[PDB]
Nucleic acid binder design. Structure first.
Ligand code: DCP
Ligand code: DCP
Ligand code: CA
Ligand code: CA
Ligand code: CL
Ligand code: CL
Ligand code: CL
Ligand code: NA
Ligand code: NA
Ligand code: NA
Ligand code: NA
Ligand code: NA
Ligand code: NA
Ligand code: NA
Length: 326
DNA sequence: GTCGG
DNA sequence: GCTGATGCGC
DNA sequence: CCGACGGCGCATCAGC
């Protein structure tokens, strides 16, 4: 891609700051700069040119100049050659191991897949599952399989109650040729912002997907969010499909449009849209868009009956889901 | 790390 | 138990 | 030690 060298560098720095430095705002600064650079329609030829872009400052511009002159960044050379940093960064790739747990593990001499396997008594249930499917969760899901997964999920939900509507969101809804995992937005008319007229609405669906052996493991589960593992059925004599991560989110039916906007992403698109909302005097979450008062306190929810309405409130031109990718 | 009050 | 902070995650 | 930065679900832990 255009400016791929630079956006790769900034992404690597982003991940180091989050995972090793435990500096989430530096992580976000790097992600923002990488994002604005990725959409820039010219080849960047200096740090100064890049510095004109919002989110690129003095330090990123200096790194861009080094990268453009030399094809590398000395800072990143050093990080890659640091065994500890590399191990910490590696461990965070396991589902359930974050920057804090990774550092603790590495501090105790645990720094490889083999070490985790020999020390499973030190891992919680989530981490054990993350470890068990480590290779599988590293793989992406071809759209072809995402379609079969969709077919399975929508068929089973219908069986439970025809009044449920399930919508596959994330990268899939943005039209990606492959996805990292499956995200299902769920609504039912019994659950709205005014009342929860039936109990166990999410549970019912999870239970049915477990009954048909689609959902194979549970990482976390509450009244509105499920996080687990699933697998397509495979044929005789053939290699199994990898196990896949699945997220299911039950959203109030009357807040569908804020919900689907959130769950379609991308993550950086959402943060950027919410940032723009804030400078326009609104706050957006997965439920509502609200105006801000003088105290910074949000007011009552604004009327919404399309994704576009949310864009209209903040004076953004509508972006189709496919144009919300990085 | 960047931006803005 | 609670509230609030922290750590995991979307 | 200029301080915000997007916003929140679920799980766990500290200090009641
Ligand atoms: N920090 C984040 C992470 C995610 N999301 C939202 C937007 C994402 O699109 C959606 C699903 O999250 P995923 O991590 O599954 O991301 P994607 O589906 O976008 O990408 P992938 O193809 O890696 O699954 O949740 C968000 O608002 N903020
Ligand atoms: N854009 C900036 C830059 C710095 N600061 C912070 C950091 C400083 O410690 C503090 C006040 O610093 P000074 O008292 O030095 O500010 P002055 O305006 O007096 O600096 P100068 O003497 O250069 O005019 O404000 C800030 O809020 N916004
Ligand atoms: Ca996804
Ligand atoms: Ca997901
Ligand atoms: Cl930070
Ligand atoms: Cl767990
Ligand atoms: Cl709300
Ligand atoms: Na800039
Ligand atoms: Na992880
Ligand atoms: Na179908
Ligand atoms: Na199996
Ligand atoms: Na409208
Ligand atoms: Na409109
Ligand atoms: Na949190």
């Amino acid at each position: 891609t255009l400016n791929g060298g630079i956006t790769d560098m900034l992404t690597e720095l982003a991940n180091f700051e989050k995972n090793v430095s435990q500096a989430i705002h530096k992580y976000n600064a790097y992600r923002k700069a990488a994002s604005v650079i990725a959409k820039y329609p010219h080849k960047i030829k200096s740090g100064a040119e890049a510095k004109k872009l919002p989110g690129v400052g003095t330090k990123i511009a200096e790194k861009i100049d080094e990268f453009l002159a030399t094809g590398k960044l000395r800072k990143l050379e050093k990080i890659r050659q640091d065994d500890t940093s590399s191990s910490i960064n590696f461990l965070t790739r396991v589902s359930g191991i974050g920057p804090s747990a990774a550092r603790k593990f590495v501090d105790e001499g645990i720094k490889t897949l083999e070490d985790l396997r020999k020390n499973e008594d030190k891992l919680n249930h989530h981490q054990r599952i993350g470890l068990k499917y480590f290779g599988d969760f590293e793989k992406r899901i071809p759209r072809e399989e995402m379609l079969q997964m969709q077919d399975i999920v929508l068929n089973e939900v219908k069986k439970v109650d025809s009044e449920y509507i399930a919508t596959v969101c994330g990268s899939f809804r943005r039209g990606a040729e492959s996805s990292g995992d499956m995200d299902v937005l769920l609504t039912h008319p019994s659950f709205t912002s005014e009342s929860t007229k039936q109990p166990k609405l999410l549970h019912q669906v999870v239970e049915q997907l477990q009954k048909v052996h689609f959902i194979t493991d549970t990482l976390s589960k509450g009244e509105t969010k499920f996080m687990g593992v699933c697998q397509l059925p495979s044929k005789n004599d053939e290699k199994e499909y990898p196990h896949r991560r699945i997220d299911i989110r039950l959203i109030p039916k009357d807040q569908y449009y804020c919900g689907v906007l959130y769950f379609t992403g991308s993550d950086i698109f959402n943060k950027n849209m919410r940032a723009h909302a804030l400078e326009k005097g609104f706050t957006i979450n997965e439920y509502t868009i609200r105006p801000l008062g003088v105290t910074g306190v949000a007011g009552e929810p604004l009327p919404v009956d399309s994704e576009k309405d949310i864009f209209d409130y903040i004076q953004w031109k509508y972006r189709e889901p496919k144009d919300r990718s990085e």
